[PDB]
Amino acid sequence: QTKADVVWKDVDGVSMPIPPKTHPRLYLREQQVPDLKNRMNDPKLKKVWADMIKMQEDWKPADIPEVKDFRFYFNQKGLTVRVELMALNYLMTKDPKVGREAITSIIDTLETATFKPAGDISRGIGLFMVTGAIVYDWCYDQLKPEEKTRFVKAFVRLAKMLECGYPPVKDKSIVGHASEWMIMRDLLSVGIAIYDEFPEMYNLAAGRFFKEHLVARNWFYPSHNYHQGMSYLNVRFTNDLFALWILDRMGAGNVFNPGQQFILYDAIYKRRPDGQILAGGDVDYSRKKPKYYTMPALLAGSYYKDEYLNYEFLKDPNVEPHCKLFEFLWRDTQLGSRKPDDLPLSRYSGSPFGWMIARTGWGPESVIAEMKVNEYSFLNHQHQDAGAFQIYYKGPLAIDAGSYTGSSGGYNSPHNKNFFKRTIAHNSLLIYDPKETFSSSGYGGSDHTDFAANDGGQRLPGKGWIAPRDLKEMLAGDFRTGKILAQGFGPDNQTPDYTYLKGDITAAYSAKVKEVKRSFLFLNLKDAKVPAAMIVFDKVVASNPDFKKFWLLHSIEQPEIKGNQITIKRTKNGDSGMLVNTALLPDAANSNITSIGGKGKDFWVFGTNYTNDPKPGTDEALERGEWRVEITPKKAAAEDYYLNVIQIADNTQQKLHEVKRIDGDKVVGVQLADRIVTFSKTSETVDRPFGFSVVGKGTFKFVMTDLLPGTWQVLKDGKILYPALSAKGDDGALYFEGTEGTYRFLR
Numbered sequence: 185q186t187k188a189d190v191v192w193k194d195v196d197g198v199s200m201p202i203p204p205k206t207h208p209r210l211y212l213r214e215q216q217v218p219d220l221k222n223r224m225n226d227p228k229l230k231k232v233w234a235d236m237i238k239m240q241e242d243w244k245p246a247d248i249p250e251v252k253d254f255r256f257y258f259n260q261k262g263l264t265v266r267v268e269l270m271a272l273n274y275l276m277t278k279d280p281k282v283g284r285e286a287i288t289s290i291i292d293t294l295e296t297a298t299f300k301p302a303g304d305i306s307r308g309i310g311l312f313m314v315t316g317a318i319v320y321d322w323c324y325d326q327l328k329p330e331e332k333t334r335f336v337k338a339f340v341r342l343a344k345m346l347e348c349g350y351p352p353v354k355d356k357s358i359v360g361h362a363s364e365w366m367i368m369r370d371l372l373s374v375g376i377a378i379y380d381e382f383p384e385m386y387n388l389a390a391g392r393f394f395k396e397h398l399v400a401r402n403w404f405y406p407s408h409n410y411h412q413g414m415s416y417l418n419v420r421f422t423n424d425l426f427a428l429w430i431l432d433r434m435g436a437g438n439v440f441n442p443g444q445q446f447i448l449y450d451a452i453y454k455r456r457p458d459g460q461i462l463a464g465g466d467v468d469y470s471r472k473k474p475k476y477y478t479m480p481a482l483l484a485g486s487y488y489k490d491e492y493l494n495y496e497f498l499k500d501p502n503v504e505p506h507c508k509l510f511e512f513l514w515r516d517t518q519l520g521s522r523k524p525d526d527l528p529l530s531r532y533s534g535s536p537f538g539w540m541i542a543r544t545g546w547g548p549e550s551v552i553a554e555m556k557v558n559e560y561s562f563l564n565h566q567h568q569d570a571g572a573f574q575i576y577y578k579g580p581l582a583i584d585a586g587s588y589t590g591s592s593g594g595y596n597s598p599h600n601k602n603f604f605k606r607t608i609a610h611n612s613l614l615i616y617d618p619k620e621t622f623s624s625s626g627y628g629g630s631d632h633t634d635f636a637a638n639d640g641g642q643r644l645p646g647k648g649w650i651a652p653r654d655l656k657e658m659l660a661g662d663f664r665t666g667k668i669l670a671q672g673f674g675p676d677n678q679t680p681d682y683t684y685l686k687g688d689i690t691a692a693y694s695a696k697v698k699e700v701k702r703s704f705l706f707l708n709l710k711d712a713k714v715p716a717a718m719i720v721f722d723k724v725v726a727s728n729p730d731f732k733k734f735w736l737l738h739s740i741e742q743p744e745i746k747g748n749q750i751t752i753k754r755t756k757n758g759d760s761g762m763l764v765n766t767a768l769l770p771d772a773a774n775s776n777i778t779s780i781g782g783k784g785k786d787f788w789v790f791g792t793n794y795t796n797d798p799k800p801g802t803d804e805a806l807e808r809g810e811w812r813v814e815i816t817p818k819k820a821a822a823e824d825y826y827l828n829v830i831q832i833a834d835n836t837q838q839k840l841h842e843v844k845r846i847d848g849d850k851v852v853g854v855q856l857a858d859r860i861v862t863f864s865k866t867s868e869t870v871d872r873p874f875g876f877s878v879v880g881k882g883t884f885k886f887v888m889t890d891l892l893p894g895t896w897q898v899l900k901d902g903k904i905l906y907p908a909l910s911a912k913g914d915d916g917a918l919y920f921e922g923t924e925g926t927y928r929f930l931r
């Protein structure tokens with residue numbers, strides 16, 4: 185970590201650091217050179233070094249693939265490993281000979297290397313460049329002049345092959361491949377290295393980083409989450425952190441908003457007791473291999489001295505071979521670790537996310553609930569899933585359906601364009617305009633289509649469903665998808681009885697709607713037999729009554745529908761959770777409850793099924809799901825309200841809680857167990873007096889939402905009960921306890 189000591193100057197109105205005139209300055213500075221001897225003698229890093237020396241042997245000829253993937257180069261072997269270890273050895277011994285061998289071992293091949301086109305080859309080329317930059321900066325004072333010219337020219341030749349182009353003016357700065365290794369590690373590392381001879385490279389690489397990449401990352405960082413889904417969180421957040429470490433070790437301090445520290449807590453909250461991670465954005469599923477965020481936990485953990493993240497890394501302290509050197513140089517072996525068992529049970533991610541993760545524990549019995557507004561969309565690996573909810577408990581119950589890969593293909597698959605990334609795949613809301621079109625001409629890198637299917641979902645923002653170049657372009661465009669209206673959890677911070685969230689998601693949709701709102705209320709019922717519930721209350725106003733509205737609930741197994749009750753079970757893979765939904769609004773007379781699914785109908789989108797069967801032996805628990813429940817109004821209307829109450833329990837639980845709808849003037853609500861929860865009848869702010877009646881035994885906990893913040897008064901049976909309570913602005917809510925009787929609220 186150290187304090188910045190380089191000189192800053194504005195370039196085109198943007199402050200940027202200037203590389204110091206001194207070597208070493210890549211991945212470390214002179215200041216930390218003498219500390220390598222101890223890292224060699226630190227046993228936890230002994231194995232790491234041992235591993236790298238093993239990596240020195242060449243690929244045995246017959247085992248070389250022939251299709252030279254990025255997977256082939258990231259599994260680094262042979263000469264390039266050797267020269268890195270020579271260059272390191274040169275820092276440690278100062279020995280002219282050791283340094284000169286590194287320079288001549290690498291230089292010929294660096295200027296000659298050829299790279300056959302293959303999947304994400306820029307990764308290979310980029311890592312080759314790193315190898316070169318290490319020798320160049322680490323052995324700078326052993327370089328002959330002719331050699332520097334040779335190296336500079338080799339680097340430029342290699343740069344011109346990178347996908348972002350050289351100059352690096354191509355692709356995207358918030359998402360996409362240019363948001364990965366090519367600029368934040370690879371191009372940056374070389375530019376730093378050759379700055380004395382050819383500063384243009386640094387000026388371009390870091391130019392774009394500070395002008396674009398950084399600005400866009402600092403903007404969302406304060407909310408401690410990431411937008412690329414729970415798989416690509418790995419590569420993308422890793423490359424942010426490479427920039428972090430690189431520039432700090434250059435002498436530029438931490439250039440990112442320090443909130444970066446808390447981003448990976450979101451992964452921790454999503455860990456299932458079966459070793460898997462809660463789904464989101466582009467992911468696949470497995471029950472064979474637990475998922476880890478090894479590199480992010482390492483880099484962020486060690487830089488910010490964070491024990492919760494460090495523990496995360498300690499789960500599987502095995503870094504990909506091309507990164508073993510960065511473990512060795514940057515890993516904090518002194519830093520401690522803690523299990524997550526003592527963290528608060530709910531975490532909130534503010535603008536531009538508006539996301540709640542809610543839990544009932546950290547052990548085998550944990551319910552895990554996710555609630556999402558989405559203020560903006562980042563595209564790429566993010567799905568158009570505004571308003572979506574997800575519930576796991578002893579297995580996935582209320583699912584985030586579909587899968588990234590399968591029989592359909594991968595990123596470019598029909599299944600991606602037409603189901604996976606679309607609203608229909610999610611526990612959200614559909615409003616079907618038969619005449620809506622969805623421009624997709626810019627999506628993906630293969631198999632381009634001008635349009636994608638109509639799923640009655642949210643728009644495809646951007647110029648044909650591509651991400652914007654950067655934050656400026658984003659904000660000037662059409663990527664806004666909603667607004668957080670209210671949020672909170674309490675009354676205790678550690679074990680909140682409820683978790684609350686409300687968003688206006690109207691902007692996610694086309695002019696087909698006038699207003700779309702969703703209020704989630706998750707209750708931690710603090711009880712083994714039935715440990716959680718979630719109330720969802722929606723307002724949908726369409727530009728045309730004849731636009732069919734849908735409410736969706738996805739599952740793995742077939743749901744049973746019995747009147748106003750929906751029962752979903754897990755009976756496979758050792759899961760045994762149960763979700764039961766009580767449909768309160770629309771009421772039985774205006775409600776159509778229908779299931780769709782089974783073979784041929786699992787990825788169904790109005791007349792067409794976007795087949796995506798797993799590659800044999802994968803997704804063994806079928807978490808890409810096979811069934812969904814649709815709730816539609818019988819009666820065509822511009823304005824409809826949905827009110828659904830979910831309960832979680834073991835699929836062996838006979839008796840659950842009875843759910844009563846509460847109807848007052850101005851408000852609509854739900855009573856179950858000892859919880860009372862109310863909403864504005866119109867889902868707009870309540871600013872006049874209102875009331876309702878409670879009937880039932882014992883003490884109740886009340887959460888009244890949609891209130892005008894200020895001082896409310898609470899009466900019961902005509903007499904003052906709480907002369908003055910305060911509804912605050914963030915949640916617009918009252919919380920209090922009370923027994924049965926007839927209530928009035930004054931303001």
Ligand SMILES: CC(=O)N[C@@H]1[C@@H](O)[C@H](O[C@@H]2OC(C(=O)O)=C[C@H](O)[C@H]2O)[C@@H](CO)O[C@@H]1O
Nearest residue numbers: 304356359360361564595596628629630651
């Ligand atoms: C700008 C963004 O929409 N670019 C797309 C790539 O993300 C996508 O590549 C897939 O995703 C990734 C990755 O982002 O790490 C790696 C693999 O190359 C792909 O699985 C490509 C694929 O055609 O399309 C877009 O250019």
Ligand SMILES: [Zn+2]
Nearest residue numbers: 464465567584
């Ligand atoms: Zn999804």
